[PDB]
Amino acid sequence: FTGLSKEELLKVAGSPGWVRTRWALLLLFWLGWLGMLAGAVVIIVRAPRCRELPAQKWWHTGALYRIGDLQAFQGHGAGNLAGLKGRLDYLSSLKVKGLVLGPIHKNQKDDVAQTDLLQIDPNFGSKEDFDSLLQSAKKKSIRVILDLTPNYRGENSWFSTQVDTVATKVKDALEFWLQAGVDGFQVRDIENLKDASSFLAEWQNITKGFSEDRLLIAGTNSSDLQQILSLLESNKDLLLTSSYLSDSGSTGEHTKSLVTQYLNATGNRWCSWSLSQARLLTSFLPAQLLRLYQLMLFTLPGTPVFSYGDEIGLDAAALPGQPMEAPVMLWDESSFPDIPGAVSANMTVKGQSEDPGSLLSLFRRLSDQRSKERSLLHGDFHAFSAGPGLFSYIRHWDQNERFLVVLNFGDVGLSAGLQASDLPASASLPAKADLLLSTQPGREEGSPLELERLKLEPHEGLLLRFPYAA
Amino acid sequence: VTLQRNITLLNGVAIIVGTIIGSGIFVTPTGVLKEAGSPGLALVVWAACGVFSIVGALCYAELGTTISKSGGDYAYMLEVYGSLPAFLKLWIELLIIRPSSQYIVALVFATYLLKPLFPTCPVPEEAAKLVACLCVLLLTAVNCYSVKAATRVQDAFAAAKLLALALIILLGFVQIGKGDVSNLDPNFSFEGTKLDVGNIVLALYSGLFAYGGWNYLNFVTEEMINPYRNLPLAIIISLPIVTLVYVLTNLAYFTTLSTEQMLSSEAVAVDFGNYHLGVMSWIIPVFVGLSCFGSVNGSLFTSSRLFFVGSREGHLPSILSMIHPQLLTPVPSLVFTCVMTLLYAFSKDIFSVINFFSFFNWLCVALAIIGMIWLRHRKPELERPIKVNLALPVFFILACLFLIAVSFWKTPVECGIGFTIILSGLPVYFFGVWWKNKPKWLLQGIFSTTVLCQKLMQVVPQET
Ligand SMILES: Nc1cc(COc2c(Cl)cc(C[C@H](N)C(=O)O)cc2Cl)c2oc(-c3ccccc3)nc2c1
Numbered sequence: 001f002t003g004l005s006k007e008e009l010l011k012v013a014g015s016p017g018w019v020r021t022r023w024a025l026l027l028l029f030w031l032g033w034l035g036m037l038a039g040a041v042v043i044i045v046r047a048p049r050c051r052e053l054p055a056q057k058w059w060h061t062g063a064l065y066r067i068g069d070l071q072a073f074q075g076h077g078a079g080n081l082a083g084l085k086g087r088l089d090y091l092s093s094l095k096v097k098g099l100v101l102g103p104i105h106k107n108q109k110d111d112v113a114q115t116d117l118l119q120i121d122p123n124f125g126s127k128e129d130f131d132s133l134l135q136s137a138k139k140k141s142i143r144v145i146l147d148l149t150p151n152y153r154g155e156n157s158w159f160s161t162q163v164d165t166v167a168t169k170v171k172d173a174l175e176f177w178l179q180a181g182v183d184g185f186q187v188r189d190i191e192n193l194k195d196a197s198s199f200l201a202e203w204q205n206i207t208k209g210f211s212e213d214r215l216l217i218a219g220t221n222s223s224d225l226q227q228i229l230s231l232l233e234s235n236k237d238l239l240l241t242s243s244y245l246s247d248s249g250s251t252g253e254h255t256k257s258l259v260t261q262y263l264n265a266t267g268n269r270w271c272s273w274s275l276s277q278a279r280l281l282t283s284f285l286p287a288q289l290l291r292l293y294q295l296m297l298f299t300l301p302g303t304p305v306f307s308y309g310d311e312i313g314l315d316a317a318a319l320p321g322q323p324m325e326a327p328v329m330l331w332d333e334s335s336f337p338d339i340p341g342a343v344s345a346n347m348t349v350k351g352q353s354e355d356p357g358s359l360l361s362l363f364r365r366l367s368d369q370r371s372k373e374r375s376l377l378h379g380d381f382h383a384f385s386a387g388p389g390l391f392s393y394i395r396h397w398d399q400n401e402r403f404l405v406v407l408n409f410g411d412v413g414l415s416a417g418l419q420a421s422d423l424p425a426s427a428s429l430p431a432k433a434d435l436l437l438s439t440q441p442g443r444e445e446g447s448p449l450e451l452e453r454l455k456l457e458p459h460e461g462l463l464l465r466f467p468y469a470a
Numbered sequence: 471v472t473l474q475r476n477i478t479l480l481n482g483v484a485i486i487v488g489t490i491i492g493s494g495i496f497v498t499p500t501g502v503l504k505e506a507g508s509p510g511l512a513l514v515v516w517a518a519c520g521v522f523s524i525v526g527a528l529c530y531a532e533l534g535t536t537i538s539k540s541g542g543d544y545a546y547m548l549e550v551y552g553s554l555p556a557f558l559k560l561w562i563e564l565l566i567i568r569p570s571s572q573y574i575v576a577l578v579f580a581t582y583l584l585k586p587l588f589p590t591c592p593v594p595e596e597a598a599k600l601v602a603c604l605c606v607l608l609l610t611a612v613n614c615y616s617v618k619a620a621t622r623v624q625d626a627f628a629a630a631k632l633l634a635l636a637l638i639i640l641l642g643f644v645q646i647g648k649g650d651v652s653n654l655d656p657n658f659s660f661e662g663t664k665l666d667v668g669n670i671v672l673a674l675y676s677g678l679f680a681y682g683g684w685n686y687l688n689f690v691t692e693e694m695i696n697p698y699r700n701l702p703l704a705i706i707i708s709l710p711i712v713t714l715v716y717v718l719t720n721l722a723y724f725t726t727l728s729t730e731q732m733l734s735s736e737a738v739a740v741d742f743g744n745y746h747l748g749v750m751s752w753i754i755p756v757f758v759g760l761s762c763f764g765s766v767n768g769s770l771f772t773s774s775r776l777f778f779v780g781s782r783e784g785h786l787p788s789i790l791s792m793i794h795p796q797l798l799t800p801v802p803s804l805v806f807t808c809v810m811t812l813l814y815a816f817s818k819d820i821f822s823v824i825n826f827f828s829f830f831n832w833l834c835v836a837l838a839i840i841g842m843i844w845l846r847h848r849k850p851e852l853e854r855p856i857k858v859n860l861a862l863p864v865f866f867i868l869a870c871l872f873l874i875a876v877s878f879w880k881t882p883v884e885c886g887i888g889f890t891i892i893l894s895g896l897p898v899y900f901f902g903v904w905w906k907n908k909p910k911w912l913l914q915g916i917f918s919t920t921v922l923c924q925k926l927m928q929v930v931p932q933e934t
């Protein structure tokens with residue numbers, strides 16, 4: 001303790017058989033270190049590797065917002081494009097990575113000579129203002145998609161007269177708007193223009209030849225799968241929105257049947273999941289199913305398309321003297337100068353922003369969850385059978401958080417009865433799963449919930465998550 | 471001819487900069503942006519953190535050169551306070567704080583060395599703990615062989631770290647030289663009024679983690695070359711350089727990556743190498759890992775010295791602090807340090823253990839700098855080769871009290887458990903040293919173990 005003697009200790013430690021002991025211990029330490037290094041190398045080599053990264057474009061990572069007419073979205077007076085500059089922040093709050101801005105080219109009757117899509121209508125605004133809107137959107141990381149439906153006022157939506165002129169005009173305005181700076185195009189009512197497949201293929205070819213980050217959308221009014229599939233034959237990069245999804249309003253398993261059939265026929269490729277081309281949810285559904293469809297469209301494998309007023313649950317039947325196609329946006333209690341009391345406090349964006357049980361809160365949380373999560377971004381989708389009226393599926397990419405969505409379309413409550421028995425063992429759901437949210441309030445959140453005692457009240461949905469399992 | 475004195479002013483700077491710069495800047499630079507939002511607020515808050523570190527470091531260097539004794543942050547407390555608080559601090563350091571930062575840094579080095587192998591999927595833990603253990607064992611062997619090799623390797627790795635930071639800032643400035651700026655010229659990105667209650671103080675709290683080694687070189691002193699001259703010079707050379715580098719690289723990070731995508735990140739300082747230089751990106755993360763490597767050595771060094779000094783006062787058993795001749799290296803102390811650092815490899819978590827005692831260093835700096843004022847009040851005649859403007863120690867006391875209050879208010883449960891752990895360590899000293907005059911059934915066994923360990927390791931006690 002007080003310090004052992006310096007000299008005798010040094011001289012005693014020289015006897016053969018003990019000086020070699022320290023050499024043996026040092027060699028043992030070094031060989032143990034080498035063995036542990038070799039074991040670490042062996043463990044590193046024998047391990048699964050990262051699969052890949054699909055290198056997705058800009059429209060794969062978020063929703064899309066449709067604004068058919070700026071007059072109703074903004075209000076009376078401020079019908080110009082610059083007004084959207086004051087509202088883009090709101091859209092950036094919704095976390096929408098697109099903006100399908102409606103047609104702006106001049107059109108006032110069924111005429112063809114003086115109605116052209118070369119330059120903007122004078123009443124809408126100015127070219128410099130449109131460029132200002134483009135630069136403001138680019139600063140805000142929002143991509144503006146234009147629309148070039150030649151006729152939208154009359155019933156004849158695509159000039160059922162000779163079609164060479166309109167095709168030439170479209171092909172001439174295309175590169176014009178490309179060098180203008182837009183990031184996509186949309187053409188609606190594709191069933192009116194003759195031999196649509198060849199023209200769509202040509203337009204897709206030119207747009208994709210200009211750049212690798214351009215997008216083209218087509219809109220059709222047919223709910224038949226065969227017609228849609230035949231349209232998507234010649235070209236494959238197309239984004240096609242059709243009214244095929246809805247087809248219902250009193251049936252629950254029909255939606256699952258259509259979704260699975262479409263995914264199987266198209267080859268598990270990229271598709272747009274929308275209820276219609278220029279219509280919102282409340283046109284085809286009652287007020288008791290909006291949250292279910294908002295939860296379904298924000299988890300299916302594709303780019304979801306919503307119209308304006310689809311997050312506050314805007315409905316056109318609840319107000320009188322209101323156009324069905326383009327109702328005004330209920331920003332606040334001052335929606336109309338007259339009838340002060342017909343509107344309610346929960347029909348405005350301000351009254352729904354902070355309400356926990358509002359539609360807008362669910363929309364914001366779902367959009368934020370879809371924008372960032374990789375499994376929801378480009379994860380594989382697998383569906384399994386369930387009870388009489390349950391739609392349940394799994395999103396899983398490689399090793400991230402797996403998501404399990406279960407929706408109840410029935411009018412009465414029933415037990416879940418979850419069972420797959422067919423999915424690959426890689427992403428088998430466990431007996432214990434977490435929770436994210438419920439469409440209708442009255443349940444717990446944030447804590448694990450056992451998957452065998454699951455119950456579902458009528459018109460409900462669950463967004464459980466579970467981590468990667470070995 | 472001297473026992474061990476090989477640290478110059480171009481070495482000490484290596485030790486300080488290596489200890490300061492670990493994974494704080496590469497891995498987690500997004501806390502300040504999350505708290506504040508605006509790049510300007512982040513820049514000014516990093517500048518404020520730098521100046522706070524400067525005012526702390528100058529006072530600590532003056533205190534260290536006032537009492538030129540090895541084992542800083544404990545020798546001052548031992549000489550001012552006495553035997554109980556010094557033992558409490560030393561025991562908690564050797565138990566939970568000192569051999570845990572080294573393990574976490576070894577783990578981060580192992581993780582960011584294997585990142586190119588698994589760019590997306592997480593690195594397996596069975597292969598990430600073993601690399602950390604390999605690093606710790608090799609560094610302990612290097613330190614036990616000699617001290618010259620340790621100094622050379624620490625200097626080389628500090629140079630590599632500074633070279634990597636120079637490379638990243640040069641690439642950022644080259645991108646600045648292009649036709650794209652992507653900077654908030656016209657308007658403010660964010661105002662950052664208040665997140666919940668933490669308007670400003672949260673940025674200060676999670677802006678002082680990038681620093682921390684401003685105060686280590688004092689754990690090594692009495693082994694330096696002319697300490698009275700080269701310790702304050704080492705601090706003055708090291709600290710403003712590191713704060714300027716932090717601010718400038720934060721500016722580069724802001725001006726080369728957008729706020730939205732970089733805020734939602736988990737393994738920052740890899741996407742920077744992937745986006746800009748594209749192919750052969752593995753030169754950015756791997757080199758970063760090498761950085762952490764060197765830092766461990768630095769810390770390891772000081773750790774040994776600490777346990778070399780505590781046992782000098784009878785606080786720790788006399789078996790330690792028994793150098794090995796013909797190499798002049800404290801073999802038992804280094805072996806003890808390596809073993810205690812390895813002992814925490816069984817903790818399956820990374821959040822606990824060290825997050826209970828975040829307030830501990832903050833209170834200990836104040837507890838060791840009040841000794842400055844006490845010594846100035848009692849014995850105002852000790853030699854002082856350097857003097858700074860007065861009334862700064864009281865300002866630093868105010869800042870330290872504010873910081874411990876902020877840490878307690880932000881998270882009181884973890885701080886309470888940490889207080890329970892530190893307070894529960896008194897029995898080991900109450901019945902460990904005070905219980906003298908023990909019979910001959912225990913002392914002889916301890917002496918026998920000491921002599922057999924001496925024979926096994928071929929060590930001799932320190933000579934005067
Ligand atoms: N009471 C206490 C005191 C200190 C000493 O002060 C620091 C040291 Cl010794 C090193 C660093 C890391 C360095 N600043 C970097 O750039 O990563 C921060 C602090 Cl506050 C701790 O360090 C660490 C630490 C350092 C790196 C990884 C994981 C944990 N925990 C500490 C707990």
Ligand SMILES: *[C@@H]1O[C@H](CO)[C@@H](O[C@@H]2O[C@H](CO)[C@@H](O)[C@H](O)[C@H]2NC(C)=O)[C@H](O)[C@H]1NC(C)=O
Pocket residue numbers: 205208209
């Ligand atoms: C886009 O259309 C172009 C123009 O036809 C296609 O390019 C060629 O088409 C001609 C038709 O005579 C063939 O001779 C060539 O073999 C085609 N070459 C290519 C590039 O395949 C092209 O196939 C279409 N696809 C795209 C997007 O390039």
Ligand SMILES: *[C@@H]1O[C@H](CO)[C@@H](O[C@@H]2O[C@H](CO)[C@@H](O)[C@H](O)[C@H]2NC(C)=O)[C@H](O)[C@H]1NC(C)=O
Pocket residue numbers: 264265
């Ligand atoms: C549509 O999905 C069905 C169900 O898998 C497929 O139809 C058969 O599926 C079984 C099992 O996968 C295969 O052994 C048969 O070869 C499939 N027959 C057909 C029609 O190909 C089918 O593969 C999917 N797509 C279609 C209609 O070919």
Ligand SMILES: *[C@@H]1O[C@H](CO)[C@@H](O[C@@H]2O[C@H](CO)[C@@H](O)[C@H](O)[C@H]2NC(C)=O)[C@H](O)[C@H]1NC(C)=O
Pocket residue numbers: 344346347
């Ligand atoms: C907005 O919240 C009010 C609060 O309940 C809802 O008011 C009910 O309105 C429904 C039909 O809209 C009636 O059946 C109930 O009698 C109303 N209850 C009360 C107490 O007002 C309202 O439904 C909510 N949303 C709508 C559609 O405005």
